């Protein structure tokens, strides 16, 4: 496996470089390629032959090599560039490829954003199946950290709560969801339930009621 740094960071509009270290049996032979892997999209070839840009790749992506170490350089960094970057080479004298360990690119300098929160009560159809789920949907926030708390009327609720880890959206903000499992009677026996979402010290609360 070729050696890449696990993580690299750069600022909007600035330049970063990602290194890829091998030996004379792979990288040292030249013909290194580079690939961009963005969750939710097919992998994308950026560079082949050490230096040649693939079709559709803009000139701010550039590749270079010195001996057993190859480098990808990205200039005019955009938030869209956040991805996992992998180098590769053929091995020895074969058509078999060896990939790098991969580098996760984080782009800093993005504007902070408050979460949009939507809270759904249990659907009639779910209650007819003798179940009840509250769905708290949390979107369009940056940075990607939130904490979620649930209340029945005024009292905290901790059992029956499952919350996802934040993940980036296609617009480069973050999303998360929280689910509160209740019994149909618990749902109907309180006057309201609330999802409370805290982000950068400020909290937003949404409330739903059985009626």
């Amino acid at each position: 496996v070729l050696n890449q740094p696990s993580s690299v960071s750069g600022s909007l509009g600035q330049r970063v470089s990602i290194t890829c270290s091998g030996s004379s049996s792979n990288v040292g032979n030249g013909y290194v390629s580079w690939y961009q892997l963005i969750p939710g999209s097919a992998p994308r070839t950026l560079i082949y032959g050490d230096t040649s840009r693939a079709s559709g790749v803009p000139d701010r992506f550039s590749g270079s090599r010195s001996g057993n170490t190859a480098t990808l350089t990205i200039s005019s960094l955009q938030a869209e560039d956040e991805a996992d970057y992998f180098c590769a080479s053929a091995e020895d004298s074969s058509s078999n490829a060896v990939f790098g360990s991969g580098t996760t690119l984080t782009v800093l300098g993005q504007p902070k954003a408050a979460p949009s929160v939507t809270l759904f009560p249990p659907s009639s159809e779910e209650l007819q199946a003798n179940k009840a789920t509250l769905v708290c949907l949390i979107s369009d926030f940056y940075p990607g950290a939130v904490t979620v708390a649930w209340k029945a009327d005024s009292s905290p609720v901790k059992a029956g709560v499952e919350t996802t880890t934040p993940s980036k959206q296609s617009n480069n903000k973050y999303a998360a969801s929280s689910y509160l499992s209740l019994t149909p009677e618990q749902w109907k026996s309180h006057r309201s339930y609330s999802c409370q979402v805290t982000h950068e010290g400020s909290t937003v609360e949404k409330t739903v009621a059985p009626t």
Partner: protein
């Protein structure tokens, strides 16, 4: 356009054989090499193997004993088999077009030689003897083999998520999430679908058969203590259209070849 489409089971039981198919379009398999690659969750890309224009196959040496690649040019199909799978074979599997060409270690006007003083190297054509890889005669030494490959992947398929597990498939129950009155009073109304208790990943959601894409947020699944997944999708529409317009979520669970379309009616 060159296009590659993976198909095959989403769930495979341990010890069994994983059989995938790659259907290609926009070129003839007779003229282009095709390769397979996988990436396990939170791990690096792993080369599996490739089949060249003439049918020559090459594999990851560490995995060769478990892999088989064949193709059918007339069908425009390439196949992969992975025998005796375990959980470490769970991964997204990609097929891809491969551009591979044999290159000489030395540029033109040079000859590769291993009889040189100091090791193997590149000597100018015309130069005689073992000093020809030295600077004064225009040559140099190299640690590269006599011939190497210019290898890269040109285009990738979307990839197929494959879970290895003893657990049975379970298709989701889909519940409409109706917009409440006080939450719609602001002009925009959020309605959604709850996709509950399914296994394995993945599930896709669209709204009104894809006609509704702006304002669609489909969230990553939660993994429950029961071992089953659940996710939700939401779309925001004008509140004036509620009751007038029909809104339908299309929930596709390819692991069970089952798709559910649920009307979401206002309260």
């Amino acid at each position: 356009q060159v296009q590659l489409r993976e198909s095959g089971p989403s769930l495979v039981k341990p010890s069994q054989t994983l059989s995938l198919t790659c259907t290609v379009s926009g070129f003839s398999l007779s003229d282009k090499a095709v390769g397979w690659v996988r990436r396990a969750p939170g791990k690096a890309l792993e080369w599996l193997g490739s089949i060249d224009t003439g049918g020559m196959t090459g594999y990851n040496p560490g995995l060769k004993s478990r892999l088989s690649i064949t193709k059918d040019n007339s069908k425009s199909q390439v196949s992969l088999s992975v025998n005796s799978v375990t959980t470490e074979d769970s991964a997204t599997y990609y097929c891809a077009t491969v551009d591979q060409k044999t290159k000489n270690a030395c540029p033109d006007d040079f000859d590769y030689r291993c009889s040189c003083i100091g090791g193997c190297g590149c000597a100018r054509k015309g130069c005689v003897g073992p000093l020809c890889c030295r600077s004064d005669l225009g040559g140099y030494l190299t640690d590269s083999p006599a011939y190497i490959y210019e290898w890269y992947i040109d285009l990738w398929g979307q990839g197929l998520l494959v879970t290895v597990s003893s657990a049975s498939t379970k298709g989701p129950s889909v519940f409409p999430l109706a917009p409440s009155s006080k939450s719609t009073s602001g002009g925009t109304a959020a309605l959604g679908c709850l996709v509950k208790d399914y296994f394995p990943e993945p599930v896709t959601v669209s709204w009104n058969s894809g006609a509704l894409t702006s304002g669609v947020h489909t969230f990553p699944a939660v993994l429950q203590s029961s071992g089953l997944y659940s996710l939700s999708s939401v779309v925001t529409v004008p509140s004036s259209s509620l009751g007038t317009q029909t809104y339908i979520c299309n929930v596709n669970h390819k692991p069970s070849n089952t798709k559910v379309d649920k009307k979401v009616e206002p309260k």
